[PDB]
Design an enzyme around this catalytic site. Structure first.
Site, PDB file in Angstrom:
ATOM      1  N   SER A   1     -10.903  -4.056   3.626  1.00 18.51           N
ATOM      2  CA  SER A   1      -9.666  -3.773   3.920  1.00 18.51           C
ATOM      3  C   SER A   1      -9.684  -2.967   5.283  1.00 18.51           C
ATOM      4  O   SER A   1     -10.710  -2.531   6.029  1.00 18.51           O
ATOM      5  CB  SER A   1      -9.420  -3.026   2.600  1.00 18.51           C
ATOM      6  N   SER A   2      -8.517  -2.230   5.580  1.00 22.11           N
ATOM      7  CA  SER A   2      -8.121  -1.108   6.672  1.00 22.11           C
ATOM      8  C   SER A   2      -7.525  -0.272   6.209  1.00 22.11           C
ATOM      9  O   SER A   2      -7.297   0.698   6.781  1.00 22.11           O
ATOM     10  CB  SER A   2      -7.234  -2.046   7.316  1.00 22.11           C
TER      11      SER A   2
ATOM     12  N   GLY B   1      -1.449  -2.469   6.075  1.00 21.28           N
ATOM     13  CA  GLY B   1      -1.907  -3.386   6.941  1.00 21.28           C
ATOM     14  C   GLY B   1      -2.600  -3.183   8.310  1.00 21.28           C
ATOM     15  O   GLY B   1      -4.519  -1.782   7.502  1.00 21.28           O
TER      16      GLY B   1
ATOM     17  N   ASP C   1      -6.732 -10.713   2.282  1.00 19.43           N
ATOM     18  CA  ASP C   1      -7.433  -9.719   2.818  1.00 19.43           C
ATOM     19  C   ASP C   1      -8.094 -10.667   3.189  1.00 19.43           C
ATOM     20  O   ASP C   1      -9.401  -9.947   4.805  1.00 19.43           O
ATOM     21  CB  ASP C   1      -7.517  -8.796   2.058  1.00 19.43           C
TER      22      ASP C   1
ATOM     23  N   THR D   1       0.869  -1.371   0.100  1.00 18.33           N
ATOM     24  CA  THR D   1       0.065  -0.288  -0.025  1.00 18.33           C
ATOM     25  C   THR D   1       0.713   0.565   0.045  1.00 18.33           C
ATOM     26  O   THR D   1       2.195   1.228   0.489  1.00 18.33           O
ATOM     27  CB  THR D   1      -0.810   0.069   1.144  1.00 18.33           C
TER      28      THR D   1
END
Lengths: 190, 350
Positions: free
Chosen positions: A72-73, A94, A43, A1
Site C-alpha cells: 500500500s501507499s 493511491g 495493488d 481511500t
C-alpha cells in the site's frame, strides 16, 4: 481511500486511512450484507514490470501470493514538535498519497504554513514511472517554464488528494483543515 | 494576514471527508470517548455515509499516539485469499488483465477493517463496540440525504460498476439512475450487518452471518474468499516507521505500507537542501523534490512488500547516509531521466 484525523481533550491522537481501493471498489455488494467489496488485489504486481491502475510497478517483493498483504501507499502520519504531537494528517490518492503527505510535512516545517494554508496550497508529484512531473492547477507560469527548462516533463492533471488534518498548538489549542478538493467534508471540534 | 484560516477548537477535534461522519466523531468525544473511540465511531459512520471509500469490506491502517507519547501502528490491510496465486491475473497470453484485478470477484482481498477497528478499540479505546457502532447503525437504518459529493461519485464512478450487480443496484440505483442529490439513501441490509456486529462482536464479520454472505457471494461468482480465509484473518499491531527531519520526528505506516519508508527517505534527502530558502512554489524547491521522489519510487518497485513474506531493507532505505548519496546526485538545474534511475545499491548501508 479516505483519511480522517482525531485529537481528544487529553491530547491523544489517531490518524486513519482506509479504503476499498478504487471508488466503490469492485462495486460488488456481498450478498444481502449490504457491504461493498474491495478491489485491493490490484495493488499487487500482477507481472514484473507491468503497471497497475496507479502506474506503480513491482517484482518478487510485491508479487501476488496466498494470504499476502498487497503493498500500500497509505500514509496516516503524525509529526512531533518539541516532543509533542504537532501535526496529524493523511490523504487518499493511491500512488500520490506519499507525495501529498510529504508536501503537507514540508509545507508545515519548511514553509511555516498554518494547517489551512498547507492544505489549500497546490500539489505536484513524480513517481519515477511514468516519467512526468504531475502538477495541479495553481503553479506560476514562470515557475513551470523554469521547470521545463530544467528538463522536467510537466503534466497538468486532475486535483490530487483530500487531506484532513489537525495541528496542535504549544498550549494544547487545536487547529484543523479540510481539503478544498473534497466538497461536503468537515473539520469540527469543541 | 492569512488568506486561509484553520478551524479552531480548545478541547477535541475531528477532520474527515464527510460532515455527518465528522459530527459523529465530535459527539463521541463530547460524550467522553477518547480519540480511538471517536476514530472507530467515525470509521463505522463513513462505512455508511461514504460508500466510495468508507467501508466494512476493505482495509487500511491506523496510527495511534497516546498523550504519553506511545506511538503505534495498526495494520488491517486485506490478506489475499489462501487460493490466490502469483499469476492469477494473467490472461492466456501471460498479460495482466486489469478487469480481473479491478472489477471481477477475484479482485477482492479478505477485508480487515472490522478486525482492525476492534483491535484498536479493545486495547486503546474505552467504549464498547456497540456504543461506537450505534451512530452508523442509525444512519444505515433511517437513512441520510444524498449530498453533492455522493451524488457526483455515484454518477461518475458508480455508473461503471454498481448497476452491473443486482444487489448493488438495488441499494444505490433508483428509477434506473444513480441516486440524485436530495434523495434519501437507506441501507437496510448494511444496518442488519452493523446491528449483528454490535451485538456479537467482530466474529460476526469473520465467522458469522456476514462471513457466510461474503463466502457465498464469492463461491457463486468465481471468487476466492472462503470462510477459512475470513476465520484466519487478523489485524496486526506493528512498529511505526519514523525519522527525524530538522528536529521534527515523523511517524507513519511500516510495511505492508510503503508510505512511512518513502516519506522518511525523501525527507532525509530533502534535509540536505535549504528548502525554506527556496520557498513554496519555486522551481528550485519543486525540482529538488521531484528528483528526490524519483529515487524513492524506483526503490519502492524493488524492495517493498509484505514484511511477513519478504525482508524489507527499511533501515537502509531510511538511512541518512544513503539519503545523502542520493542528494549528491540531484542537479538543481538538470532533471535526471527516469531511464537513468534504478533501485539503489543498499549494501553499503545494510
Amino acid at each position: 481511500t479516505t483519511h480522517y484525523s482525531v485529537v481528544d481533550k487529553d491530547g491523544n491522537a489517531v490518524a486513519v486511512t482506509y479504503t476499498l481501493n478504487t471508488t466503490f471498489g469492485t462495486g460488488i455488494v456481498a450478498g444481502e450484507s449490504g457491504i461493498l467489496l474491495n478491489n485491493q488485489m490490484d495493488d499487487f504486481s500482477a507481472k514484473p514490470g507491468v503497471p497497475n491502475v496507479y502506474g506503480l510497478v513491482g517484482g518478487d517483493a510485491n508479487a501476488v501470493g496466498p494470504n499476502k498483504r498487497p503493498l500500500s501507499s497509505m500514509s496516516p502520519t503524525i509529526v512531533v514538535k518539541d516532543g509533542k504531537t504537532w501535526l496529524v494528517t493523511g490523504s487518499p490518492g493511491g500512488s500520490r498519497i506519499i507525495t501529498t503527505v510529504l508536501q503537507m510535512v514540508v509545507n508545515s516545517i519548511d514553509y511555516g504554513l498554518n494547517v489551512a494554508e498547507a492544505t489549500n496550497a497546490p500539489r505536484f508529484h513524480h513517481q519515477w514511472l511514468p516519467d512526468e512531473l504531475r502538477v495541479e492547477k495553481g503553479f506560476s507560469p514562470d515557475t513551470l517554464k523554469l521547470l521545463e527548462a530544467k528538463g522536467q516533463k510537466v503534466a497538468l492533471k486532475e486535483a490530487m488528494g483530500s487531506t484532513q488534518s489537525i495541528m496542535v498548538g504549544p498550549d494544547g489549542e487545536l487547529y484543523g483543515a479540510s481539503d478544498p478538493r473534497s466538497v461536503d467534508d468537515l473539520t469540527a471540534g469543541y | 494576514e492569512d488568506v486561509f484560516h484553520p478551524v479552531r477548537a480548545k478541547q477535541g477535534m475531528v477532520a474527515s471527508v464527510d460532515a455527518t461522519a465528522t459530527q459523529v466523531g465530535v459527539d463521541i468525544l463530547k460524550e467522553g470517548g477518547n480519540a480511538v473511540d471517536a476514530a472507530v465511531a467515525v470509521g463505522y459512520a463513513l462505512a455508511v455515509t461514504h460508500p466510495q471509500a468508507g467501508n466494512l469490506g476493505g482495509g487500511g491502517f491506523m496510527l495511534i499516539r497516546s498523550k504519553n507519547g506511545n506511538t503505534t501502528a495498526i495494520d488491517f490491510r486485506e490478506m489475499a485469499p489462501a487460493k490466490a496465486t502469483r499469476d492469477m491475473f494473467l490472461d492466456d497470453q501471460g498479460n495482466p488483465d486489469s478487469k480481473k484485478s479491478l472489477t471481477s470477484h477475484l479482485a477482492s482481498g479478505t477485508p480487515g477493517t472490522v478486525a482492525g477497528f476492534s483491535l484498536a478499540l479493545d486495547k486503546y479505546g474505552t467504549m464498547p463496540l456497540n456504543k461506537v457502532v450505534q451512530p452508523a447503525f442509525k444512519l444505515a437504518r433511517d437513512g441520510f440525504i444524498v449530498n453533492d459529493a455522493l451524488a457526483d461519485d455515484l454518477k461518475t464512478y458508480g455508473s461503471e460498476v454498481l448497476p452491473n450487480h443486482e444487489n448493488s443496484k438495488a441499494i444505490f440505483w433508483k428509477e434506473g439512475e444513480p441516486l440524485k442529490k436530495g434523495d434519501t439513501l437507506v441501507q437496510a441490509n448494511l444496518a442488519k450487518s452493523l446491528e449483528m456486529i454490535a451485538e456479537n462482536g467482530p466474529d460476526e464479520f469473520y465467522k458469522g452471518t456476514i462471513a457466510e454472505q461474503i463466502a457465498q457471494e464469492m463461491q457463486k461468482n468465481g471468487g476466492l474468499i472462503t470462510k477459512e480465509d475470513l476465520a484466519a484473518y487478523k489485524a496486526v499491531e506493528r512498529t511505526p516507521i519514523s525519522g527525524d527531519y530538522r528536529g521534527y520526528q515523523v511517524y507513519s505506516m511500516p510495511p505492508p505500507s510503503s508510505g512511512g519508508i518513502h516519506i522518511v527517505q525523501i525527507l532525509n534527502i530533502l534535509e540536505n537542501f535549504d528548502m525554506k530558502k527556496y520557498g513554496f512554489g519555486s522551481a528550485d524547491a519543486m525540482q529538488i523534490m521531484a528528483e528526490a521522489e524519483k529515487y524513492a519510487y524506483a526503490d519502492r518497485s524493488e524492495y517493498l512488500g509484505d514484511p511477513d513474506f519478504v525482508k524489507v531493507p527499511w533501515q537502509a532505505l531510511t538511512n541518512k547516509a544513503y539519503a545523502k548519496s542520493i542528494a549528491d546526485q540531484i542537479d538543481i538545474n538538470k532533471a535526471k531521466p527516469s531511464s537513468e534511475i534504478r533501485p539503489g545499491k543498499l549494501a553499503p548501508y545494510e
